[PDB]
Design a protein around this motif. Structure first.
Motif, PDB file in Angstrom:
ATOM      1  N   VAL A   1      63.895   2.226 -21.369  1.00  0.00           N
ATOM      2  CA  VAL A   1      63.197   2.230 -20.050  1.00  0.00           C
ATOM      3  C   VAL A   1      61.707   2.439 -20.323  1.00  0.00           C
ATOM      4  CG1 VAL A   1      63.052   3.179 -17.710  1.00  0.00           C
ATOM      5  CG2 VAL A   1      65.270   3.135 -18.978  1.00  0.00           C
ATOM      6  N   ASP A   2      60.836   1.531 -19.867  1.00  0.00           N
ATOM      7  CA  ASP A   2      59.360   1.658 -20.035  1.00  0.00           C
ATOM      8  C   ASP A   2      58.664   1.180 -18.753  1.00  0.00           C
ATOM      9  OD1 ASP A   2      56.790   1.877 -20.988  1.00  0.00           O
ATOM     10  OD2 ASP A   2      56.949   0.338 -22.493  1.00  0.00           O
ATOM     11  N   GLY A   3      58.727   1.984 -17.710  1.00  0.00           N
ATOM     12  CA  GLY A   3      57.969   1.786 -16.464  1.00  0.00           C
ATOM     13  C   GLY A   3      58.762   1.131 -15.338  1.00  0.00           C
ATOM     14  N   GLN A   4      59.998   0.685 -15.600  1.00  0.00           N
ATOM     15  CA  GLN A   4      60.828   0.096 -14.503  1.00  0.00           C
ATOM     16  C   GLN A   4      61.187   1.179 -13.491  1.00  0.00           C
ATOM     17  OE1 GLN A   4      61.589  -0.214 -17.837  1.00  0.00           O
ATOM     18  NE2 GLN A   4      61.059  -2.403 -18.156  1.00  0.00           N
ATOM     19  N   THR A   5      61.428   0.769 -12.245  1.00  0.00           N
ATOM     20  CA  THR A   5      62.074   1.596 -11.227  1.00  0.00           C
ATOM     21  C   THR A   5      63.581   1.568 -11.485  1.00  0.00           C
ATOM     22  OG1 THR A   5      60.283   1.277  -9.642  1.00  0.00           O
ATOM     23  CG2 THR A   5      62.468   1.908  -8.760  1.00  0.00           C
ATOM     24  N   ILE A   6      64.233   2.714 -11.414  1.00  0.00           N
ATOM     25  CA  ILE A   6      65.671   2.843 -11.730  1.00  0.00           C
ATOM     26  C   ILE A   6      66.456   3.160 -10.448  1.00  0.00           C
ATOM     27  CG2 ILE A   6      65.303   3.508 -14.110  1.00  0.00           C
ATOM     28  CD1 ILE A   6      66.097   6.413 -13.274  1.00  0.00           C
ATOM     29  N   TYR A   7      67.672   2.630 -10.407  1.00  0.00           N
ATOM     30  CA  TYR A   7      68.711   2.968  -9.419  1.00  0.00           C
ATOM     31  C   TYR A   7      69.438   4.233  -9.904  1.00  0.00           C
ATOM     32  CZ  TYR A   7      73.343   2.407  -7.035  1.00  0.00           C
ATOM     33  OH  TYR A   7      74.521   2.579  -6.325  1.00  0.00           O
ATOM     34  N   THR A   8      69.512   5.237  -9.035  1.00  0.00           N
ATOM     35  CA  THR A   8      70.264   6.476  -9.361  1.00  0.00           C
ATOM     36  C   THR A   8      71.465   6.566  -8.430  1.00  0.00           C
ATOM     37  OG1 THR A   8      68.218   7.599 -10.036  1.00  0.00           O
ATOM     38  CG2 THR A   8      70.127   8.988  -9.668  1.00  0.00           C
TER      39      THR A   8
ATOM     40  N   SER B   1      68.248  -5.354 -23.747  1.00  0.00           N
ATOM     41  CA  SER B   1      67.509  -5.860 -24.937  1.00  0.00           C
ATOM     42  C   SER B   1      66.017  -5.659 -24.750  1.00  0.00           C
ATOM     43  CB  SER B   1      67.824  -7.271 -25.279  1.00  0.00           C
ATOM     44  OG  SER B   1      67.452  -8.187 -24.263  1.00  0.00           O
ATOM     45  N   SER B   2      65.310  -5.821 -25.861  1.00  0.00           N
ATOM     46  CA  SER B   2      63.866  -5.495 -25.939  1.00  0.00           C
ATOM     47  C   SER B   2      63.039  -6.279 -24.912  1.00  0.00           C
ATOM     48  CB  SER B   2      63.365  -5.698 -27.358  1.00  0.00           C
ATOM     49  OG  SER B   2      63.486  -7.052 -27.779  1.00  0.00           O
ATOM     50  N   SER B   3      63.360  -7.540 -24.631  1.00  0.00           N
ATOM     51  CA  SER B   3      62.507  -8.314 -23.701  1.00  0.00           C
ATOM     52  C   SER B   3      62.556  -7.677 -22.316  1.00  0.00           C
ATOM     53  CB  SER B   3      62.842  -9.769 -23.627  1.00  0.00           C
ATOM     54  OG  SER B   3      64.170  -9.951 -23.186  1.00  0.00           O
ATOM     55  N   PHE B   4      63.690  -7.121 -21.895  1.00  0.00           N
ATOM     56  CA  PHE B   4      63.764  -6.403 -20.597  1.00  0.00           C
ATOM     57  C   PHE B   4      62.932  -5.130 -20.624  1.00  0.00           C
ATOM     58  CE2 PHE B   4      67.691  -9.075 -20.178  1.00  0.00           C
ATOM     59  CZ  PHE B   4      67.283  -9.785 -19.075  1.00  0.00           C
ATOM     60  N   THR B   5      63.057  -4.313 -21.669  1.00  0.00           N
ATOM     61  CA  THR B   5      62.304  -3.048 -21.806  1.00  0.00           C
ATOM     62  C   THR B   5      60.804  -3.343 -21.685  1.00  0.00           C
ATOM     63  OG1 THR B   5      64.015  -2.064 -23.164  1.00  0.00           O
ATOM     64  CG2 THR B   5      61.824  -1.081 -23.341  1.00  0.00           C
ATOM     65  N   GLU B   6      60.397  -4.406 -22.354  1.00  0.00           N
ATOM     66  CA  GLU B   6      58.956  -4.755 -22.517  1.00  0.00           C
ATOM     67  C   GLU B   6      58.390  -5.302 -21.225  1.00  0.00           C
ATOM     68  OE1 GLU B   6      59.610  -5.557 -27.265  1.00  0.00           O
ATOM     69  OE2 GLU B   6      59.305  -7.303 -25.966  1.00  0.00           O
ATOM     70  N   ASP B   7      59.208  -5.682 -20.245  1.00  0.00           N
ATOM     71  CA  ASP B   7      58.701  -6.211 -18.961  1.00  0.00           C
ATOM     72  C   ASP B   7      58.836  -5.142 -17.866  1.00  0.00           C
ATOM     73  OD1 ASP B   7      57.861  -7.448 -16.829  1.00  0.00           O
ATOM     74  OD2 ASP B   7      59.303  -9.123 -16.933  1.00  0.00           O
ATOM     75  N   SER B   8      57.799  -4.344 -17.642  1.00  0.00           N
ATOM     76  CA  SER B   8      57.828  -3.187 -16.713  1.00  0.00           C
ATOM     77  C   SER B   8      57.981  -3.649 -15.264  1.00  0.00           C
ATOM     78  CB  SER B   8      56.583  -2.325 -16.840  1.00  0.00           C
ATOM     79  OG  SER B   8      55.436  -3.073 -16.459  1.00  0.00           O
ATOM     80  N   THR B   9      57.772  -4.937 -14.962  1.00  0.00           N
ATOM     81  CA  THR B   9      57.673  -5.430 -13.564  1.00  0.00           C
ATOM     82  C   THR B   9      59.043  -5.843 -13.017  1.00  0.00           C
ATOM     83  OG1 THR B   9      57.264  -7.769 -14.076  1.00  0.00           O
ATOM     84  CG2 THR B   9      55.365  -6.329 -13.994  1.00  0.00           C
ATOM     85  N   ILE B  10      60.058  -6.044 -13.875  1.00  0.00           N
ATOM     86  CA  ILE B  10      61.402  -6.540 -13.453  1.00  0.00           C
ATOM     87  C   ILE B  10      62.402  -5.393 -13.582  1.00  0.00           C
ATOM     88  CG2 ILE B  10      63.250  -8.114 -13.992  1.00  0.00           C
ATOM     89  CD1 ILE B  10      61.122 -10.259 -14.596  1.00  0.00           C
ATOM     90  N   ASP B  11      62.960  -4.958 -12.461  1.00  0.00           N
ATOM     91  CA  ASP B  11      63.869  -3.787 -12.412  1.00  0.00           C
ATOM     92  C   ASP B  11      65.324  -4.244 -12.562  1.00  0.00           C
ATOM     93  OD1 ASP B  11      61.627  -2.120 -11.937  1.00  0.00           O
ATOM     94  OD2 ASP B  11      61.821  -2.480  -9.731  1.00  0.00           O
TER      95      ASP B  11
END
Length: 330
Positions: free
Chosen positions: A53-60, A113-123
């Motif tokens: 997780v690197d800046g995404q908004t998370i569902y709790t 995967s890393s491409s998701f982690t690296e894209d902070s704009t897509i939750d």
């Protein structure tokens, strides 16, 4: 019922589009990538490996009074770009642009995967292909559109993507103010689970139209237009200094070029992609080599009408008992 939500490019190149989605009670708003090429609604969550997780908004889910664990259910998906994610599943209330589905499967990521982690704009992703591709095991789940369909005024959704600008996803109605001329409808095969159709041909710039059948998928989750190598070579031959680079991974062109338009057929109708839509900018910061937005499908196994093509049109995804696609100029 109907819904209407604005979709916004994630960066200055239109690499993808995000649409706000309300999940749970009280609402948790996440920005999802609406993907007509896949069938999973999955989200970054309180369960996602912390280092991924690197800046995404998370569902709790523990903060939602309507969340229920779907006992035993898991999911795992791999995309055409090599990216992947997996996890477990909740049912919860999901709303898009005022349209609400209760008991929607919300797939909670434990790993990305890393491409998701690296894209902070897509939750996360919201899939809009057919539910036959949904990866939940052992009980396959329905897409948001499939769950909403019976409640909609008309069993349709529409994609109106902007060039370097916001656009719209509508559910359950066709906005007759959003396009010019008429909508041309074309047949769909659902045999591979995709919005698969056959284009009637192409033209390059002001060149003559070539009548030829091009089978492919309408895929909002893919950035570029992927076509047979013959068609792609014919396009890039019109741009001085354009070449296919194995080191970069596709056709590149001098950033000083003015690109020609590309036209694709939909029955007897024509959609024109302006040349500027085909420019994806420097291959690396400060380079004078620019990446092309039309690429060969030869190493994929399918042609892909991705955002480069779809943003030139108003696109109707008709989910009637026999599905069809519609395209209009705008």
């Amino acid at each position: 019922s109907t819904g209407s939500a604005t979709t916004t490019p994630i960066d200055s190149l239109d690499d993808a589009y995000i649409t706000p989605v309300q999940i749970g009670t009280p609402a948790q708003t996440l920005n999802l990538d609406f993907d007509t090429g896949s069938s999973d609604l999955w989200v970054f969550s309180s369960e996602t490996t912390a280092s991924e997780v690197d800046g995404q908004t998370i569902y709790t889910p523990s903060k939602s009074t309507t969340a229920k664990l779907l006992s035993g259910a898991t999911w795992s998906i791999s995309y055409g770009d090599g990216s992947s994610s997996s996890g477990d599943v909740y049912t919860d209330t999901v709303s898009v642009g005022g349209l609400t589905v209760t008991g929607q499967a919300v797939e909670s990521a434990k790993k990305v995967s890393s491409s998701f982690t690296e894209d902070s704009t897509i939750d996360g992703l919201l899939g809009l292909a057919f539910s036959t591709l949904n990866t939940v095991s052992p009980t396959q789940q329905k897409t948001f559109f499939d769950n909403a369909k019976a409640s909609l005024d008309s069993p349709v959704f529409t994609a109106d993507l902007g060039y370097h600008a916001p656009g719209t996803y509508n559910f359950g109605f066709i906005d007759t103010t959003a396009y010019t001329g008429s909508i041309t409808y074309t047949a769909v095969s659902t045999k591979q689970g995709f919005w698969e159709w056959t284009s009637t041909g192409y033209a390059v710039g002001s060149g003559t139209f070539k009548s030829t059948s091009i089978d492919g998928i309408a895929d909002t989750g893919t950035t570029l237009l992927y076509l047979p190598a013959t068609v792609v070579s014919a396009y890039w031959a019109q741009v001085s200094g354009a070449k296919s680079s194995s080191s970069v991974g596709g056709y590149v062109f001098p950033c000083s070029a003015t690109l020609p338009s590309f036209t694709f057929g939909v029955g007897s109708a024509r959609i024109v992609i302006p040349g500027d839509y085909i420019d994806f900018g420097p291959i690396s910061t400060g380079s004078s080599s620019c990446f092309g937005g039309i690429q060969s499908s030869a190493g994929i196994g399918i042609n892909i009408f991705g955002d480069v093509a779809l943003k030139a049109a108003f696109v109707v995804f008709n989910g009637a008992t026999t599905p069809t696609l519609g395209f209009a100029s705008k």
